């Protein structure tokens, strides 16, 4: 048992100066610092893992899943679409980018 995912941070939603779009989240992936390098992570599964107070099915760990869609900017930031939109309180929180849709 060890780590099989890439580190990521939830920066913000897709937004203009004054209008936000919570349907898409901006994700900064560790080690990805180019829009060309973001192509590898395009389509990869990305999950937000958090702990609650009430156990469900004998577990307090709840995961919200999503997929990386397209790169954002020139610095390797990517756009992610989740099944449920990430809460804005999770800005700056950690995310796990898996390798499940692998192509290598």
């Amino acid at each position: 048992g060890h780590r099989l995912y890439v580190k990521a941070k939830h920066l913000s939603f897709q937004r203009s100066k004054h209008v936000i779009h919570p349907g898409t989240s901006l994700v900064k992936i560790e080690g990805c610092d180019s829009k060309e390098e973001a192509q590898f992570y395009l389509g990869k599964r990305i999950c937000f893992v958090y702990k609650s107070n009430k156990p469900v099915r004998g577990s307090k760990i709840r995961v919200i899943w999503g997929t990386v869609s397209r790169p954002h900017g020139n610095s390797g930031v990517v756009r992610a679409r989740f099944t449920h939109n990430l809460p804005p309180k999770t800005f700056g929180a950690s995310l796990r980018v898996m390798l499940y849709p692998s192509n290598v």
Binding site: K9, L11, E30, G31, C32, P88, F91, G92, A93, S94
Partner: protein, 196 residues
């Protein structure tokens, strides 16, 4: 691209605004930042210009009640804290959390002198300012605007420097013995085949 738990930054040789921008972005990204030796920060422009800038800031206080007016902190760490707060949306819960994730101190106190200290190249004065361009030190600026701990910080820093020199020499001797033993290993050729 740094996802560390806590990052400790040596503020010496760093430009105030550029370091504040980098720290503020890291705080919003969710990284705890500790800044040490804030009295060694650098601001572009000559000392008289920076002194006038601080005096102009100091003149701004509430007319009917200075007690509730603007609070002008003189310490170099608080000057850096004010800069970071300006670059942060401090009037929101998210901005308040980011600001509270920042710890700026003068010198390197006992909590942090035994930890790795990194630098931000984007804010380093030597590679961001033309040689010959005048610059000031926030420690000198603070001491001339009412900071009363310039000498004690210098004395404590000197004591930390001699302690760190002794620690470095001891680690230097240990790394020597490890390196000398490493040069006599029987797997150097096979490691060099893979490039190690």
């Amino acid at each position: 691209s740094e996802f560390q738990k806590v990052v400790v930054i040596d503020a010496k040789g760093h430009l105030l605004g550029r370091l504040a921008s980098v720290v503020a972005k890291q705080l919003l990204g969710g990284q705890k930042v500790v800044v040490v030796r804030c009295e060694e920060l650098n601001i572009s422009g000559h000392f008289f210009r920076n002194k006038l800038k601080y005096l102009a800031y100091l003149r701004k206080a509430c007319r009917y009640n200075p007690s509730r007016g603007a609070f002008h902190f003189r310490a170099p760490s608080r000057i850096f804290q004010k800069a970071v707060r300006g670059m942060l949306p401090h009037k929101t819960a998210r901005g308040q959390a980011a600001l509270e994730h920042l710890q700026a101190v003068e010198g390197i106190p006992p909590p942090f002198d035994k930890q790795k200290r990194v630098v931000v190249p984007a804010a380093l004065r030597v590679l961001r300012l033309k040689p010959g361009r005048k610059y000031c030190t926030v420690g000198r600026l603070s001491s001339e605007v009412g900071w009363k701990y310039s000498d004690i910080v210098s004395k404590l820093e000197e004591r930390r420097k001699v302690k760190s020199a002794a620690f470095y020499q001891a680690k230097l001797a240990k790394q020597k013995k490890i390196a000398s033993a490493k040069a006599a290993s029987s797997v150097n050729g096979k490691l060099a085949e893979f490039g190690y």
